[PDB]
Design a protein around this ligand. Structure first.
Ligand SMILES: [Zn+2]
Ligand SMILES: [Zn+2]
Lengths: 106, 98, 49, 49, 55, 19, 42
């Protein structure tokens, strides 16, 4: 199972655990799974911006950015809205390094 | 009574008058009579508020009432665009029942 | 402005962006030609007077 | 970008469009008054010489 | 209040209309009576203190 | 703009120029 | 001026800025210096 978990792709909801997120219980009546799979997506409509790329190593940032964009959808009043990923100012490099820097001491 | 209030709420959420007419489009009879950045016409409320929003720069995008109402109008437009609810009825009409 | 009152076309910048979002690049690359097109043309501005 | 992007209203008929658009600028009648100014300009330069 | 989406004032009736505040007020007034202290009971965390009204 | 949303969702050179 | 104070990937901007900051105040770019009042080096 250790050799398994080194390699397979984890589901989106499960990758909250590296960053201690959790789905709130207010979202239990509503669907979330289709919104995560289809309505918070990366690589926006304007194309690449080079603050949008993530390396093939450490691709868990996609799944946490899913939670991030869906929280940004659900906090707004009105309908749920399709959201695409604008600039991140550090790159996937700097985001991965800062995430690893916090995960040094939990 | 309640049914009046819920009916007014339905008419508020469903009717911004985007209602479709069959005519040749004319430069006078446009919904965007005077767009308030540059005074053009675009014949539809969705393109009109897209015109109002696009002249604003995209780093200065703050949610407000008009920003909510654009998504409301787009949502209701696609819902009325769906055909099964284009042609539907809840109750009889003395001919279908007969 | 007398021509803007008359002319039937309406310049919409969304056509060039919605057709340049179709490109297929490999993302393991620093050089972005489609994003160079978009950031160079800047369709999102008004005022084609 | 204005050459690369431009569209019409979605179902238009041109004679109706121009027959609405050209009507107020021909309801205007400023163009006839400039010809009298042209008269008196030519008469003034001739009587000056 | 003002609903931002529906763009109208809600017709939730005001506080002057509701039955239970009126019944609450009148039962507290009739249970107090000539007493200067007006609450029917007092809630300490262990047990409650009552009011010495014969009714 | 907030008000408008409520109703929406419910010299020789200058003298030569003027001449 | 502020927007102009604000293309390529983030590692490449870090390399460019480190290169320019290295060659920034080196005495190969600077111009218009002063006499020294030598009074040595006869
Ligand atoms: Zn405008
Ligand atoms: Zn207001």
């Amino acid at each position: 199972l250790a050799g398994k978990i080194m390699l397979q792709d984890v589901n989106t909801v499960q990758l909250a655990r590296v960053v201690n997120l959790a789905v709130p219980d207010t979202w239990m009546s509503l669907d979330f799974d289709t919104m995560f799979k289809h309505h918070v997506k990366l690589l926006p409509k304007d194309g690449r911006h080079l603050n949008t790329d993530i390396p093939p190593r450490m691709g868990w940032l996609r799944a946490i950015l899913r939670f991030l964009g869906a929280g940004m959808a659900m906090t707004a009043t009105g309908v749920a809205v399709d959201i695409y990923l604008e600039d991140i100012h550090g790159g996937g490099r700097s985001l991965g390094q800062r995430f690893m820097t916090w995960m040094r001491q939990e | 009574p309640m049914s009046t209030r819920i009916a007014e709420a339905t008419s508020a959420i469903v009717s911004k008058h985007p209602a479709r007419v069959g005519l040749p489009p004319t430069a006078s009879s446009g919904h965007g009579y005077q767009c308030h950045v540059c005074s053009a016409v675009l014949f539809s409320p969705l393109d009109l508020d897209a015109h109002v929003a696009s002249h604003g720069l995209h780093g200065n995008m703050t949610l407000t009432s008009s920003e909510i109402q654009r998504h409301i109008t787009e949502f209701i437009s696609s819902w009325q665009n769906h055909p099964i609810v284009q042609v539907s009825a809840d109750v009889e009409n003395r001919k279908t029942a007969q | 402005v007398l021509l803007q009152r008359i002319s039937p076309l309406q310049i919409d910048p969304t056509i060039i962006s919605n057709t340049m979002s179709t490109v297929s690049e490999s993302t393991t690359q620093t050089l972005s030609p489609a994003s160079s097109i978009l950031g160079k043309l800047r369709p999102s501005n008004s005022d084609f007077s | 970008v204005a050459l690369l992007s431009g569209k019409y209203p979605p179902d238009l008929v041109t004679n109706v469009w121009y027959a609405d658009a050209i009507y107020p600028m021909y309801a205007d009648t400023e163009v006839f008054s400039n010809l009298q100014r042209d008269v008196i300009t030519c008469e003034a330069v001739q009587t000056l010489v | 209040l003002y609903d931002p989406v529906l763009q109208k004032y809600d017709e939730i009736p005001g506080l002057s209309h509701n039955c239970p505040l009126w019944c609450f007020r009148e039962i507290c007034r009739h249970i107090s009576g000539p007493l200067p202290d007006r609450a029917p009971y007092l809630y300490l965390s262990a047990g409650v203190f009552w009011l010495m009204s014969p009714r």
